[PDB]
Design a protein around this ligand. Structure first.
Ligand SMILES: Nc1ncnc2c1ncn2[C@@H]1O[C@H](C(=O)NCCO)[C@@H](O)[C@H]1O
Length: 229
């Protein structure tokens, strides 16, 4: 449907982030998990004021799935979600007041030889680190005040469409990563489980990985959400 170019500062930001974490690519998952935590924190706080805030989906979880066969990684939360306008502005521009400070602090850091990965985490701009391991990033989101929408980008542009599938999330957001060939190891359950456990121990919400256990030629395989924190 509707196509957009990234704001120039976001193009600059993306490159800064990519270069900062280029040799620590796994950090992308830490940031997606941190963002999902923030979104969950937000709807939890809204529920203090809105008696019907959780009506679209009564759960408060992060859920992560590998799809080796389709080369996809999904990170789904039932947090606050994003309206169409929010997908466009939050992901495509320097929206928040603090974000603009990131760019300056990031540059002053890289000159003074200070660590920068803490800056990415502190300012919550880690979403773009997804492009370290993904050729395409897809964001499906449902907010109580809007219909379900899909944002998609290969980092050279982005587009937003209303989801033709309707409201499948209930409430929350899915980050779908179309993984680079070099990043296929993030499709392995053992790798993902190890990373999710490392980055979710400090999160105040339950995080699940869609895992499998095979028995016993005759084989029996059991699929279900394995709690990681
Ligand atoms: N899972 C997520 N759920 C709800 N909102 C999310 C989200 N992941 C990112 N966002 C929103 O997009 C913004 C964002 O990550 N912009 C890119 C860096 O500035 C976040 O500040 C947040 O407001």
């Amino acid at each position: 449907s509707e196509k957009f170019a990234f704001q120039a500062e976001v193009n600059r930001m993306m490159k800064l982030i990519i270069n900062s974490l280029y040799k620590n690519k796994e950090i992308f998952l830490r940031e997606l998990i941190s963002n999902a935590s923030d979104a969950l924190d937000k709807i939890r706080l809204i529920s203090l004021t809105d008696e019907n805030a959780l009506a679209g989906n009564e759960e408060l979880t992060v859920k992560i799935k590998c799809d080796k066969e389709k080369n996809l990684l999904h990170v789904t939360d039932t947090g606050v979600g994003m309206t169409r306008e929010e997908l466009v502005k939050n992901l495509g521009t320097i929206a928040k007041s603090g974000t603009s400070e990131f760019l300056n602090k990031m540059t002053e850091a890289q000159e003074d030889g200070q660590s920068t990965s803490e800056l990415i985490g502190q300012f919550g701009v880690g979403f773009y680190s997804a492009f370290l391991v993904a050729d395409k990033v897809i964001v499906t989101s449902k907010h109580n005040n809007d219909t379900q929408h899909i944002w998609e980008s290969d980092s050279n542009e982005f587009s937003v469409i209303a989801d033709p599938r309707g409201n499948t999330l209930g409430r929350g957001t899915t980050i779908t990563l179309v993984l680079k060939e070099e990043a296929s190891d993030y499709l392995e359950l053992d790798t993902i489980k190890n990373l999710v456990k490392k980055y979710s121990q400090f999160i105040n919400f339950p995080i699940y990985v869609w895992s499998s256990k095979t028995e016993t030629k005759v084989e029996k395989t059991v699929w279900d959400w394995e709690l990681m924190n």
